[PDB]
A and B are shown apart, each in its own frame.
Chain A
């Protein structure tokens, strides 16, 4: 599997980075949405994880969404593909 491997990108920035995963690994996407001292900000992080488990949790006024993926270069935020 090939996943996009990017650290905290601004909402409207595309991940140009990739990584061939290890065995049993899936594509994960972590989206953080919430208020900053620069306004309401959306970030996205992507990587090869050993066991991905989907979750949506509001943590101290920050919506944190983790999603999971089995197809190559599929860890793209919903607002991009």
Chain B
């Protein structure tokens, strides 16, 4: 049958857990014997890794890392690496046009596997990076039956931002499309990563514009925010027990105020491999904060403070520190500044931490910095909502009220109530 697939330029290398770095064995379309030579296990699910644009025409160092993580997590699976390197080492708008041909080559290969060995497409998960997410989506749209999953790892933005659904990744391309947006910084059509939601679940770590640990200090520096999507996904493969929670929110601004930390009917989901495959009418744009390094997981808290005073005082751009103490551990001197701090007014805000403090017990609050007497607010209670545990916690002052004075001693609050939200 080799004659029927001779026009295909993309190569399909079936890597193994012991040999993750090289394209040793190829699954050649039309040659059923190659599938047996490469020892493809017909009883296992298939992960097809699709790379992006490569200025050097060779594999970026993340490829052996993802393949290694996918075999660690799923040891009996088949990790196929799709090679479209010559088409990927061209002027960007040329390479971006080639995703339609690579998509066609991927779909024809998936269809040949279905036809030749009755392999189910419901056992196929496509993982496309940058241009590869678009080619994964194009492929998904050309299969005889829908593929089970497509994971878009920061799909490319220029030429795709205003592209119609057939020309890019869309939710229609697979039964479930999950996207990680990590380099949306720039104006629409001029952002490295796609801005617009293109899946069923579109996750935007740290707002999605840029990633932590990526400010200055082959073109590794210019691409770490883009490439963080793969490492965020690798981390989810390596920590099945402790997934990173994403939260559905109206905007990245409302999520920064701690307004979106709910888990009620898929308002929260797992980032990565352990995602709950929930399809919705409109796409749920989701948010979360992360660390700068692997393990990326953080704990999100909304903090609400009512500031009570005698006289009508207003203070702008005020710096504070919050210390959280739990049964497991503690996380001290967490800074946050408030734009306005007024008398008899309440303020909400998001606080996050890499530390698993456990169940909260104590909260310490410091107001950071004579011609004038130091300003102050009387605080009775602090309400905290914990996103990961889904617990509404109340802290109340040790005495009747805890006096919060600028540059002075911190206010101490202890837990006085707990409620589970589920």
Contact = CB atoms under 8 A, between A and B. Distances in A.
Contacts of B412: 36, 60, 62
A36 B417 contact: no
Given A7-B394, A7-B416, A59-B362, 11 more contacts: A30-B361, A38-B399, A45-B415, A45-B417, A47-B417, A49-B418, A53-B359, A57-B327, A60-B364, A62-B412, A62-B414
Contacts of B364: 60
A50 interface: yes
Question: Interface extent on A, as a size class?
Answer: 20 to 34
Contact of A64 (B399, B409, B414): B414
A46 B417 CA distance: 7
13 contacts: A7-B394, A7-B396, A8-B396, A8-B414, A34-B398, A36-B398, A36-B399, A37-B399, A43-B398, A59-B362, A60-B364, A64-B362, A64-B414
Interface of B: 325, 327, 330, 359, 361-362, 364, 394, 396-399, 409, 412, 414-418, 420
A32 B398 contact: yes
Main SS class of interface, A: strand
A41 B398 contact: yes
B417 A7 contact: yes
A43 B402 CA distance: 14
A22 B416 CA distance: 18
B401 to A, nearest CB: 11
A30 B420 contact: no
A32 B325 contact: no
A59 B416 contact: no
Contacts of B361: 30, 55, 57, 59, 64, 66
